[PDB]
Amino acid sequence: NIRVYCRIRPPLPHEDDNIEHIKVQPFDDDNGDQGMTINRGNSQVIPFKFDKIFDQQETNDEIFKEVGQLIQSSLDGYNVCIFAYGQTGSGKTYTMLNPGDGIVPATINHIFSWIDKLAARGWSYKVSCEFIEIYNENIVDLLRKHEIRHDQELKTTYITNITTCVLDSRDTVDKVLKRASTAANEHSSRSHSIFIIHLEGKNEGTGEKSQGILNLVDLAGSERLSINKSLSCLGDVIHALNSKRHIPFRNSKLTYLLQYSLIGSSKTLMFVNISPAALHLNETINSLRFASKVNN
Ligand SMILES: Nc1ncnc2c1ncn2[C@@H]1O[C@H](COP(=O)(O)OP(=O)(O)O)[C@@H](O)[C@H]1O
Ligand SMILES: [Mg+2]
């Protein structure tokens, strides 16, 4: 299962708040989809359809209501990927990492709720995480040679010398996230940011085990400037997973790292973040056309 949401951020103060060129239709019930058009100027109107479209008023909290169900998969042993795609400036970091509100803090919080509750059935759970950044195919550890190693048999993935932080408490979580320059911003906007949560549960009373990975990914900006190569290769991978045939995971680090959370029963959701601004009509269109191939 692969789902695609689109999110339009509100206009910024230093920009022009004219959003006449984007129009979003109501959620089509009997076809499970939401449409939008973009008026390109010269009256050439381009249609798009996604699984859900979030307008400028929609908040991080509202957005999590429509993601929560996917997160709950990792308790049934599914692997999960949530990607944020779109141009630098469109709100990827804000969507994934906004304090308290973003997909990452919200996900972590949501998972604890379920852990608290499942303890009543004798499930006990270990939660650990890793937080990495990939730039020009170099892995940097944001909790500090880093090599990827897969275990064919157990279908698991390891990155060498990465600090894995054990999430023991809501206090322990809060420290890690509270912890999370001009050059630095340019740098991270050309990088993927991956937050990996591992969920391990055992239930002595039944004997049952469970594992779940959640990969919360904040991608390199999609505008044209290697970053280009890994975005295309992600596109090709996901589309081909949607269509039994051969998938070149190894063609880029990002897809090679995430391969076991993209094959099989794995569930994926992509956020296409778009800017509402006039100057960015073209980059918005590329983002939408990309999101369509990934979805269609
Ligand atoms: N949904 C939103 N609501 C309010 N402000 C937003 C939203 N999305 C983005 N912003 C603001 O717009 C700017 C760009 O967001 P950011 O997340 O840094 O973009 P990106 O990571 O996609 O390059 C930031 O200043 C951010 O606070
Ligand atoms: Mg960013």
Side-chain angles (χ1 to χ4, degrees), residues 183-199 201 203 205-207 212:
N185 284 335
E186 190 46 44
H187 183 89
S188 60
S189 88
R190 287 165 187 248
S191 302
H192 320 295
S193 282
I194 306 143
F195 201 90
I196 305 183
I197 311 166
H198 290 254
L199 281 211
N203 179 325
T206 63

Side-chain angles (χ1 to χ4, degrees), residues 223 225-226 228 230-243 246-269 271-278 280:
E223 66 287 3
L225 311 153
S226 206
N228 278 326
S230 90
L231 294 170
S232 296
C233 174
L234 183 65
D236 287 348
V237 159
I238 292 169
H239 165 78
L241 281 163
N242 249 32
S243 303
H246 183 263
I247 305 165
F249 289 104
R250 75 186 188 75
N251 275 31
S252 84
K253 188 152 258 183
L254 179 55
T255 47
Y256 190 70
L257 166 64
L258 296 170
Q259 61 173 26
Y260 296 123
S261 286
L262 303 157
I263 47 131
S265 46
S266 294
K267 314 199 200 283
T268 294
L269 157 68
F271 280 95
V272 186
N273 294 91
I274 57 162
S275 152
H280 308 138

Side-chain angles (χ1 to χ4, degrees), residues 97-125 127-132 134-135 137-143 146-151 154:
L97 292 176
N98 201 233
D101 268 286
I103 301 315
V104 167
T107 291
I108 281 155
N109 210 58
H110 194 77
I111 281 159
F112 279 171
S113 275
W114 290 107
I115 274 48
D116 289 356
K117 293 165 152 170
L118 289 172
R121 314 303 156 200
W123 280 94
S124 90
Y125 267 103
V127 184
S128 42
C129 78
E130 285 133 10
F131 194 22
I132 66 168
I134 303 191
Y135 176 75
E137 304 217 310
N138 285 306
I139 299 173
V140 171
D141 183 9
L142 313 171
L143 308 182
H146 298 306
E147 281 168 4
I148 308 165
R149 312 269 235 250
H150 300 296
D151 189 294
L154 285 217

Side-chain angles (χ1 to χ4, degrees), residues 7 9-10 12 87-95 218:
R7 173 178 210 185
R9 71 160 171 75
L12 292 159
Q87 67 170 136
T88 295
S90 62
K92 297 184 293 305
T93 299
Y94 179 95
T95 296
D218 171 11

Side-chain angles (χ1 to χ4, degrees), residues 134-135 137-143 146-151 154 156-167 169-170 172-173 176-177 180 182-185:
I134 303 191
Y135 176 75
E137 304 217 310
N138 285 306
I139 299 173
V140 171
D141 183 9
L142 313 171
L143 308 182
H146 298 306
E147 281 168 4
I148 308 165
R149 312 269 235 250
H150 300 296
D151 189 294
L154 285 217
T156 45
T157 301
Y158 305 99
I159 311 146
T160 66
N161 309 306
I162 287 296
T163 44
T164 156
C165 167
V166 168
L167 301 174
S169 73
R170 281 183 187 86
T172 306
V173 163
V176 177
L177 301 173
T182 183
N185 284 335

